[PDB]
């Protein structure tokens, strides 16, 4: 009997001061707000119903109307920022936090969900949820000896809401809130449900997207080996955030990068750098470029794991955005590597696919490649073998592309090409 009511009829029932009439009309609003297409969120807001729903959250003696209003407000808060703000403006944040302690699991779960939508809107509402004290009661719901005893749907919703408390920047979440959540997140990252694992990895990826000190708070909890394990999962929704987190970590110090290498991550890169999902190859190549920006002993582990041929492969054929990350990986490698390491790059076949990418109408990748060539020549100088390299560049059509770039518009580009020609080709 609560199917497809008009907003007018919902209002009439909610304004009746008969609690059971109010319950039926609130369920009718919940069903409207739950429909597949175009839920009438603005019309419900415009009818003035949010304050009434918020007061219903407080009706301990009518748990059904607490549930129905919590679900209705969850779905309003699922909308635009302005729609979420209307829920926050009605006083919903403290009312939902109070429902976290509900003895009815389905009501506590709905309050978890609503707070996830609020916090997920952005940094300010995230921080406002934290200031109203959401973290303690959320974490208390997970304080069980074995997460396997919780209902799977309930645990997934908690994990997702915690990941929204970790999400967003400018500012990043308060340091003390992150320290408070992290031990529970570490435990969720070891749980066996694929959706819990994915959202735990997303949360970790948000917390490592930041300066070195934020990375260190995570790395010090010892999660890198579990992240590397998940990097090999068969589920793409797990691999994607695990790889984003690993990539964020290797943007940190060389010691943080070494923990990634120590845990075995490089052995997964033959598959990641050939992965059929373009986004995975791109993120894996970006991650490789931050590893080849490391120490010579880290470059050497890239060599030992057989990854330079995989970088030649991606430079030769990949989505253009991936090829650009590969060009960066090569310039970083040639900037930091030993003479022997750089020589090895040439023996693996780097020169021809590098030259072919000089036809790209992207100015910064051209700058990147020209820098690499110069670095490779400098290594060749120290061995007295620049002429061998010049001929290599000439035989594959590279000298033509470099000469043509002397007449390229970008002054940084034509200066670099002029120097190369002047220095090694005449």
């Amino acid at each position: 009997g609560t199917v497809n009511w008009s907003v007018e009829d919902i209002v009439k029932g909610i304004n009746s001061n008969n609690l059971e009439s109010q319950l039926q009309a609130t369920q009718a609003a919940r069903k409207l707000l739950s429909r597949e297409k175009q839920p009438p969120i603005d019309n419900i807001i415009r009818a003035g119903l949010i304050p009434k729903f918020v007061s219903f959250l407080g009706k301990t003696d009518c748990s059904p109307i607490q549930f129905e209003s919590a679900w209705a407000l969850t779905n309003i808060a699922s909308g635009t920022s302005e729609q979420t703000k209307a829920v926050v403006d009605g006083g919903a944040i403290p009312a939902f936090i109070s429902l976290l302690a509900s003895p009815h699991a389905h009501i506590s779960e709905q309050a978890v969900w609503a707070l996830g939508n609020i916090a997920g809107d952005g940094s300010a509402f995230r921080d406002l949820v934290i200031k109203h004290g959401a973290i303690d009661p959320l974490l208390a719901l997970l304080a069980v000896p074995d997460l396997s005893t919780l209902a799977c749907g309930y645990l997934r919703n908690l994990t997702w809401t915690l990941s929204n408390l970790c999400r967003n920047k400018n500012p990043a979440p308060p340091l003390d809130a992150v320290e408070q959540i992290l031990p529970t997140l570490v435990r969720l990252l070891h749980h066996n449900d694929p959706e819990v694992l994915a959202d735990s990895c997303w949360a970790i990826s948000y917390l490592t997207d930041g300066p070195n000190e934020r990375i260190e708070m995570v790395v010090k909890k010892g999660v890198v080996p579990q992240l590397v394990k998940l990097l090999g999962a068969t589920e793409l929704p797990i691999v994607t955030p695990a790889l984003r987190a690993i990539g964020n970590i290797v943007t940190g110090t060389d010691e943080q990068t070494q923990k990634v290498i120590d845990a075995g991550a490089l052995a997964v890169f033959p598959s990641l750098l050939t992965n059929p999902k373009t986004n995975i190859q791109k993120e894996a190549t970006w991650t490789m470029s931050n590893i080849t920006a490391g120490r010579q002993d880290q470059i050497q582990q890239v060599v030992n794991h057989g990854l330079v041929p995989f970088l030649v492969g991606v430079l030769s054929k990949a989505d253009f955005k991936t090829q650009k990350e590969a060009a960066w990986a090569i310039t970083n490698y040639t900037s930091g590597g030993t003479v022997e390491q750089i020589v090895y790059l040439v023996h693996c076949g780097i020169i021809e696919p590098l030259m072919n990418l000089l036809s790209a109408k992207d100015t910064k990748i051209i700058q990147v490649i020209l820098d690499a060539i110069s670095n490779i020549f400098q290594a060749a100088e120290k061995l007295g073998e620049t002429e061998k390299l010049s001929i290599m560049i000439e035989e594959c059509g590279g000298l033509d592309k470099i000469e043509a770039l002397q007449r390229h518009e970008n002054e940084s580009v034509y200066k670099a090409s002029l120097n190369l020609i002047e220095k090694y080709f005449s």
Partner: peptide, 6 residues
């Protein structure tokens, strides 16, 4: 050398 450029 490091690039926070995802």
């Amino acid at each position: 050398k490091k690039r926070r450029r995802e």
